[PDB]
Write an enzyme that holds these catalytic residues in place. Structure first.
Site, short mmCIF file in Angstrom:
data_model
loop_
_atom_site.label_atom_id
_atom_site.label_comp_id
_atom_site.label_asym_id
_atom_site.label_seq_id
_atom_site.Cartn_x
_atom_site.Cartn_y
_atom_site.Cartn_z
N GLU A 205 -5.23 -8.83 2.11
CA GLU A 205 -5.62 -8.41 3.45
C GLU A 205 -7.14 -8.32 3.54
O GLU A 205 -7.79 -7.74 2.67
CB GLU A 205 -5.00 -7.07 3.83
CG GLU A 205 -3.57 -7.13 4.34
CD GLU A 205 -3.05 -5.77 4.79
OE1 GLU A 205 -1.95 -5.37 4.33
OE2 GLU A 205 -3.76 -5.10 5.57
N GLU B 125 0.81 -1.22 0.00
CA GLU B 125 0.00 0.00 0.00
C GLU B 125 0.84 1.27 0.00
O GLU B 125 0.88 1.99 1.00
CB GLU B 125 -0.95 0.05 1.20
CG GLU B 125 -1.97 -1.07 1.27
CD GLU B 125 -3.17 -0.71 2.11
OE1 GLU B 125 -3.80 0.34 1.84
OE2 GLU B 125 -3.50 -1.47 3.04
#
Lengths: 461, 461
Positions: free
Chosen positions: B365, B165
């Protein structure tokens, strides 16, 4: 110049709770629970859960300590790590294994073990159930835990101690709010004092019953700072008289002489706050004095009159008979707020020599703490702690006058070897010969560390 | 009743900095320095210095994860632990041995290693000297570190990721104060976004020059939460249009398509905030797209028109085009402040299928944090986190609809395997299939742990 007896022991002192971390520790002690519920009360929110990571780093920590000339390391076994069921003293499997590793690794690094059985670390479960050291049942279970330490490790450990400074457990847990559970009850504190002396004696008893071999010896560790009177005026000398009986003879006399000082027990009786004792117990005290003494000293203690009359209507505390006194012109460690006075080392040596049979004794703690040691790192990250070497020099010199005058001082243990966790102050002040960067658990000898290695080889300086 | 493709991977996710602790780590990353200097910025004063003790207990930790049904584990290698000198990418001998130790232990416990290279953990020394990701020299240094990871561990690691990210690094470090250095500056953030896209791309190139076997793939982990318009009001649609380009296409397109989204670059140019790029750099970005995609999803994201015109003179920020919207009637995880919306899982799967070539991808995730899970301990100390099981069922159901419509999703990684340290929130919220009592670093499967093991053996539920 300054020289020391032959075979003098040069060493360092700490405790289990201040070094190991709580890694896989089965039971919470009173400080563990305090930090879990009120981390606000700890400097920089740093608790014991990692401390100086001794649980993981023990082998290299021992290597560095020996590098810094630690011939004997005094530390402690955690009741809350060793024992599974407190009532039966069954063993925690991981805990016993860990302490074997530590002791084996001490020996492999040529460091003499000195094992203290208790350093302010009462299991909080035993406080919740029995109110802790107030309970003579808990006293019995301390002995059961002590018996276990004796059987498992007595084969390669010679030097034991029952307690480190029971007074601080009394003061801290029952008088002045320093230790969780922070009870403020004078009469309760007196019973706790008695109960801990009872426990140390019963522990000497079982130690000698479970010790065959003659070099094995068990002592106790007390702070024996005199209570200096603030002047020669009778009111001040009376304050100094009681404060001496209360802070020193409360433990010294039952530990070494085998009975409580009768001026003190008289005063507590007249005050109606005397402990619940039995002649069987008092005879256990009398039958089992310690084989040696460890002496902690850091800064002096001076005493004057109490501001108001001890007969005033107030809750009973020992403090109704004496008030601390600040002497004008005193030499101060200003940042820490302590007086500097190495002369008390000489007085303590004399007192043991004359009034305590010259019983074998060591200075088991002495050292100087300083905050923010990064201010003094040199170019290879070695703290330039000249102040620490100065402090040891003044105090070792004073110690040397007492030895020369015939005091039976057998060793000197520095506080501390590696920076360690100082209860609510955590890592604010650093006492080590060895710096610990607690973010990384990276450890490095300070300058004082090679000086202490040099001191031990010259047996003097 | 809900079943998944044959060969589907059931995994768990974490990162080095949130698990290892800083034991014997050579360099500080920005979070280490942030905690060392400003511990009050972290929940309950808990920082990364011990975290979940993975440095010391990795072997038993992975055994617990194996028990909870982790077939594959994705974590990260810390730049600040692996590298001695950043300029050279010389190796820290001790850090190299640690990661060898954990990878080999992963295989020994039959866990497939998924290695991410960077998880919010820039060396602080590179921010001090070069301003970190704003520096294309720092970009090059990252590639030299990635290259070392491949040569040391490529021989038994098949699945790599350049970044977790990078948008959170851009938002955290340069927009909203979430990460140290806490710079608030749109133009800089735009350049950092570019620089990390370029670093990811040169890494893929280097990886493809060094990767031998065809099983070796490298990807990137992005959060692909859609930006749902609050309504059909044109101003709200224009806000979603830009929020979509900025939060998703800014990274998805260069990584998968090879180019930045043209409408975005036109927008940044008119505003005078476009990055400095060179045609050689854009060519590397075009020629080294990822092999596969990791997708993070937790909670949806909704957007309405901004309160004030983006022409108002104010510091430039992507937010001048969209404002977050709270949908009435939304479904809420009330204590965490997040809407629950499994349907976004299906939307995400469709987008990848329709618009991104149906590139191989995984949910890297997905999870649910709850505070104070000790309140749900059963008799035997197992957290009864039925809520966590309900959460997985809902999102996995949404996932399966996406797959059934033809999306090329190949696995599902839960955040997290063991409770881990969540930056400034630390252990306020627990996400793991396995509890960590962080005072003692004692870990215990939860109820979800067993349900997830069973999910993997049934490949469905």
């Amino acid at each position: 110049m300054v020289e020391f007896p032959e075979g003098f022991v040069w060493g360092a002192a700490t405790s289990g709770p201040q070094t190991e971390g709580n890694f896989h520790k089965q039971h919470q002690n009173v400080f563990d629970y305090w930090f879990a519920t009120e981390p606000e009360q700890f400097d920089a929110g740093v608790g014991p859960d990692t401390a100086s990571n001794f649980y993981n780093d023990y082998d290299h920590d021992l290597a560095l300590m020996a590098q810094a000339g630690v011939q004997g390391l005094r530390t402690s076994i955690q009741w809350t790590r060793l024992i599974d069921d407190f009532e039966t003293a069954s063993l925690n499997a991981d805990g016993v294994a860990f302490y074997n590793h530590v002791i084996d690794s001490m020996l492999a690094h040529h460091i003499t073990p000195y094992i203290n059985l208790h350093h302010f670390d009462l299991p909080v479960a035993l406080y919740d159930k029995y109110h802790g050291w107030e309970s003579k049942h808990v006293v019995e279970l301390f002995v059961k835990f002590a018996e276990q330490c004796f059987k498992l490790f007595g084969d390669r450990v010679d030097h034991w101690y029952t307690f480190n400074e029971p007074k601080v457990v009394v003061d801290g847990q029952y008088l002045y709010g320093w230790h969780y559970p922070q009870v403020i009850n004078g009469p309760k504190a007196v019973q706790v004092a008695y109960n801990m002396n009872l426990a140390s004696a019963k522990t000497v008893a079982r130690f000698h019953e479970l010790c065959v071999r003659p070099e094995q010896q068990i002592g106790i560790i007390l702070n024996l700072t005199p209570a200096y009177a603030a002047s020669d005026d009778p009111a001040d000398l009376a304050a100094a008289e009681f404060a001496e009986l209360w802070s020193n003879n409360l433990f010294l006399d039952p530990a070494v002489l085998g009975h409580f000082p009768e001026k003190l027990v008289e005063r507590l009786t007249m005050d109606g706050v005397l402990w619940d004792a039995t002649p069987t117990e008092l005879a256990i005290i009398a039958a089992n004095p310690v084989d040696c003494l460890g002496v902690n000293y850091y800064h002096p203690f001076r005493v004057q009159r109490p501001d108001i009359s001890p007969k005033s209507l107030q809750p009973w505390m020992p403090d109704i008979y004496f008030k601390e006194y600040d002497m004008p012109g005193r030499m101060m460690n200003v940042d820490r707020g302590w007086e500097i006075y190495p002369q008390a080392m000489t007085d303590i040596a004399r007192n043991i020599q004359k009034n305590y049979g010259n019983i074998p004794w060591m200075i088991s703690e002495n050292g100087m703490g300083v905050a923010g040691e990064e201010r003094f790192l040199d170019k290879q990250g070695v703290v330039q702690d000249d102040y620490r070497i100065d402090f040891m020099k003044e105090h070792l010199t004073a110690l040397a006058k007492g030895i020369a005058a015939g005091s039976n001082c057998q060793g000197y243990f520095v506080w501390s070897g590696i920076d360690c966790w100082s209860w609510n102050h955590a890592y604010h002040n650093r006492y080590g010969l060895i710096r610990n960067d607690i973010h990384t658990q990276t450890k490095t000898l300070k300058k004082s560390a090679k000086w202490f290695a040099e001191l031990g080889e010259r047996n003097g300086f």
